[PDB]
Amino acid sequence: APSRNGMVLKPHFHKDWQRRVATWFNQPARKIRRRKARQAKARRIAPRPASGPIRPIVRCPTVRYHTKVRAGRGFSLEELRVAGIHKKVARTIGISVDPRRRNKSTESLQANVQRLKEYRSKLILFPRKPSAPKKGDSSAEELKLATQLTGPVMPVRNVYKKEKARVITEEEKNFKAFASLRMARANARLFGIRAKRAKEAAEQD
Amino acid sequence: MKFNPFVTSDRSKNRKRHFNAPSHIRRKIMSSPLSKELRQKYNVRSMPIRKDDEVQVVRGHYKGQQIGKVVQVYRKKYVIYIERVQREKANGTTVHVGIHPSKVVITRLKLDKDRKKILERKAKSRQVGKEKGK
Amino acid sequence: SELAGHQTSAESWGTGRAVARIPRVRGGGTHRSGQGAFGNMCRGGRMFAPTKTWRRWHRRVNTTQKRYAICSALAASALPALVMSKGHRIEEVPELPLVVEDKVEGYKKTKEAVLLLKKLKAWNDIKKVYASQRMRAGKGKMRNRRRIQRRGPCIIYNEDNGIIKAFRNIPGITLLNVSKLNILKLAPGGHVGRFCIWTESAFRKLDELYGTWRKAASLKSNYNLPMHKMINTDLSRILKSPEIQRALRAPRKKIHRRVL
RNA sequence: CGCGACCUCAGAUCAGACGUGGCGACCCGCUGAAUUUAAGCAUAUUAGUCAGCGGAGGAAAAGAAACUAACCAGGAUUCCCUCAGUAACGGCGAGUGAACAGGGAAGAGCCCAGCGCCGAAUCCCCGCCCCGCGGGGCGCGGGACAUGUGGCGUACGGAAGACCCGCUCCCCGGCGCCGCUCGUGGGGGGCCCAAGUCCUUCUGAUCGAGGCCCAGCCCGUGGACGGUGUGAGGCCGGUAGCGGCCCCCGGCGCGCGCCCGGGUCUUCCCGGAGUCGGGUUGCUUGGGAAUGCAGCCCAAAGCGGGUGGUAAACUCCAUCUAAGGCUAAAUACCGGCACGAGACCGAUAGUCAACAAGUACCGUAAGGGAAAGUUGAAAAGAACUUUGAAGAGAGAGUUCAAGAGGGCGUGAAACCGUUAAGAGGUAAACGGGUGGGGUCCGCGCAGUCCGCCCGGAGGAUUCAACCCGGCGGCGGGUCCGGCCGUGUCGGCGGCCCGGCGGAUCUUUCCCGCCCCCGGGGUCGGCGGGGGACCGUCCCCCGGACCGGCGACCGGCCGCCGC
RNA sequence: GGCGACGUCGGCUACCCACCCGACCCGUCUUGAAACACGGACCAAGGAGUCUAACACGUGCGCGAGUCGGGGGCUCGCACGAAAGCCGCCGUGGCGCAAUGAAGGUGAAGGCCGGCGCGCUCGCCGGCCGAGGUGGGAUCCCGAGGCCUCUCCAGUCCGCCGAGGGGCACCACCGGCCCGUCUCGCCCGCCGCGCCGGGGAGGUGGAGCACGAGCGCACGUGUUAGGACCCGAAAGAUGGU
RNA sequence: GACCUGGGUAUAGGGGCGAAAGACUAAUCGAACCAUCUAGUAGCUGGUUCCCUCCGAAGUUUCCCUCAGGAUAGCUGGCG
RNA sequence: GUGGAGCCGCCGCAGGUGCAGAUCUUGGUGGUAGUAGCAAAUAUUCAAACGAGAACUUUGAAGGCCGAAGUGGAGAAGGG
């Protein structure tokens, strides 16, 4: 059943497979169906934008992916706390809330606190009957457009430092090398043992 | 060119709505034109035919200039019978023959109260399109 | 057929009885009682390879070839030979890139937009199209395609102000927006050189939409109009040049037949 | 003992309600084989599928972490692309085989028990009337439940009370109604462009040809269908943010009904058990020193518990808060009620069925289950005369055709009948070479060469030869007017009123940051926003060579037509 | 050069007949068919290498150290449009550009000249360069010489050209480099002096480098998983009458 | 006479029933019938549909629960 | 020649694309062939009738068999 040189093959068709198959003869029909549910939804509601709330800025989980920025889930309260808005007020204003999200940095915390007040800067509200509790005049002179698109404040913005040019100094060109890693790794798998060999000198008495 | 999606274009289906058509829709598809003068007095194009209208026969074996009323309108077999056009059988008995009313000209109508509401509504709705061009 | 011929309980008769070993249906009574059941051989049988709906219907062509093949389909609409050798009759018409002004798009009643086609003498082609109103040869006449129709010119435009109305009743004609072109409608049958009528607002955009060789295009991101493998393409002007006929051996024109 | 309160209970054709059954395409729970592959075959595979059993819905299931991670941390579920035919499992053989990252579709969140405060502030039924539709309510009185605990506030993201301080009186459904509806909502019925005008063919036109200079006519209508044959115009109708007519949808404003949130400080409260886990046994998974599931035994604790993918002990840390509950979209649909389309099949095909098809018929029964379309435009479906008792004829008649005569269009081959031509002891038939006969074909018939040139003869024209008059081309011409190729610069000319880039350059520039004792030091960079500069394509003058399919002009030679 | 019609001229086909010669009935497995091997009475229609998944190579095309939108999105509420076009601050991803080890991990540059530390077989500094070298090697270059009507006064050209040069791809070979290891010897470093790091010289194992050729699409062939070229069992299991 | 028989009634598929023969259990019995998994599997038979052109074999070696089979090497064409 | 409404060249594309065989499937027809056969239970004959038509239908006469555990008279089951 095999012949002259070729791949060895395990094709997974020993199981019954012709009674579960899924031809996508409706994937054009499902694309222009779920465009009607974006046409006749984003006009049906409001001058509120399409594509949902403001999402915060979020840095990725894998070592592979920690260098990059992603539209996360919700500002996890603290960003509602340093910026100072009420949590059940926030999700009717148009601000997403994700309570099980934590903050264990101060660098990333203020990165959304300015973002939230920046959203609150570019927000205009409609008071019901124009007595205006804590909203200004005529509707920002007008609503200027009907709907906004693909995210409020461009949630990617994968910005990068310029770091233009420098003069190599004395300390920078002599030290920071490969041997600073082989001894760095040697204080990762020869550190706990050297805690134990100093216990040998405290029991030598 | 047809742009309305919810109506057919296939030969094998408009025949099924034609040969198996209900019998009051069937009087609509058996409709005859009005004559060249009589479409200008009553300013309307064509009409569903009925039992006491005298008209000449235009395309067939029996062509032209024999104005004489119809006698019986077989809706089922898409055929009217006109009092002049007949055929001697092999018996010597004379029977009518059938001619489809889209090959037939009304040269005088019968009017009643129900036809005036047709000859008004079908005539009002042509000067609707003439006043589209304001 | 979803499941044809297998909707039948049958088996081989097995033993002797002087019959072939095809499966026979069971029972008694009716006619279809001992006949040959499923198998491509038999009447009322499942066909060989009952076709599946998951044939690879749709094909891929990568985008740069779809853009190479449509640069190559517009340039053949400029040469006075290729657009006549396809079948379009541009015999009495002026300049092959027919460009009319933007006032065509304000046509809203087709009495107007026909004597556009007459005054440009482009009506010598639609007079041919009425002749090609035949009926289909074969068994297509019951699959609701019945009338063959020779394709005519295509008016290519942008910013419709009614021209999609007063041209969509003329037979054989096609109207395609100069933003969103189509290789299938610029070359009917894969035979290059369909005749086209342009418009000022359409004809000017192609320098900024397919670009040139000097720059790139601005309405497509990563495209430049492709390279031309022959700079000087007429070899009859090349093979009769003094660089070559200085270098050649000589011609050699005796016949030297078979000597007895 | 008799009466009574309860507790566990019965009985009823008590009053009023409820559940079973059908379908099962998709969904949920459970039970679940073998053929097959391994070239044998026990593990494995086929497969957690087929069958069986039960549950529902227009979707169901799933769901707001007892998570994934181990770095700069993500953040309910579901689905698709990738992860990946990879880790891992396996007579480590055959073969099976996830998930996290990451990009998208959609993105909605919440409730309770418990610990506590409020004098059950809770609910059902019954009767009356408020007053309103086709009915549901707050009132008014009477029977229950319930203290073995109803209702408000409350949920782990913290909460509650007392303070203190600074803002604010809302929201909620309905109501007869008036104005919009988004394709302008949905459903229903009746309407809306233009030729039969002339000739002509046919049995019949829908065919052929014609319609002066406006192209016979209408085109937002040339899709399709029937109509005696091929029809934009003869008719249904196609087109149109076309009209009018009827019925129903979500969203005005009087009379309803509920109706104080916010930040700090102080104190107080803070959680689901035969459950978690362990031992063993079966199934299962890629889960491998047991991933899930279930049985039986042992059975928890509170700085406790679950998890951290190699058994275990110690030691830190990371994350999470279980044994209680609801929830829209994204998703699945070979059953149905409707639809639309097809590089489909076209009566031995396509479903089993184009037709009185799950019908005739068979079997005791489960169950098996067909063959079968066409006269013609119109039945005009043969009146009538004649032989026969009739079946059937022969005449006559209809129609374009009975060479279409009631399973009747086209009518093939095998096979049969007769006529005709030929032939006959090795069965016939075949291959090769002729001969003889015939049917017919052309040839067409001692009647076949045909076109150029030239010399004769009659016969009748008219350009040529020459030239001006002529509109048009070809060929080289000074590129003189307009041309474009690649460049140097300049005018940066529009850069600060070009276009686009560049991980070029810009702490003296523009606010909001961190650092530093009501303000400063750029005090270094941030988020943001300029403008200086490089590279490349746009107007101008100068410079390059051919003025090339980039062409008009005049000038010339040499054509050509009238 | 010569000869002839109203029945005569030329000609065959799937026409018939006669004759001479050669001639056993096809399909099929098989060393061996006409076989006393088997299927075939005769016609009509139906009837058997398919479709997907995957890999290989061949070839065609587009782009090329890259490539590819397949999954989403945008573009009136449009027949053909279930198309086509566009995105790129949708390149996430896939395959490729880097290999090797069980793994922790590590991870592919030389050539010359000057000179120096005891040029110790061992070693080091400055510069130019830069994929090393031997042999073949199509092509290209130089080319002595040869080439024309009288002997000198010369030119682009052409024509063979002995030798000699720069030598593409590829082949044989020697040398180097990366990684795993093995043997042998000293040297250097210090986010902090150790059962730490880095190293050199020879020998070997590798699906490697030594100036990249891949990806996508399409087609053909081959091999497999699929009812898998059509038709064929004795059986097996589940649920029923 | 352990006799013959109508009707009623009981037992069902690895089950029933048997004065035993592997009989009988709806013309079927050393495991019934029907539908499904199912188009189950076969190294074994039968078949395999147009013409011309060009090239044109092998039944041998090694290994296999291998001997009617495959692998491999050989012979062969196609592309260069 | 029959027949009465469709069809084909060329350039591309796409297949359910070609039959002499499968004890092939389905429909059709032959040689056999006017042949095997219409032979279990004894057996029919004459005239008249209605009839276009008489061995077989009816009527009569005669000769027969079944022969009371019937080739007789009535039923249950089954058939409709």
Ligand SMILES: [Mg+2]
């Ligand atoms: Mg045909």
Ligand SMILES: [Mg+2]
């Ligand atoms: Mg329901």
Ligand SMILES: [Mg+2]
């Ligand atoms: Mg048929």
Ligand SMILES: [Mg+2]
């Ligand atoms: Mg691909």
Ligand SMILES: [Mg+2]
């Ligand atoms: Mg069994």
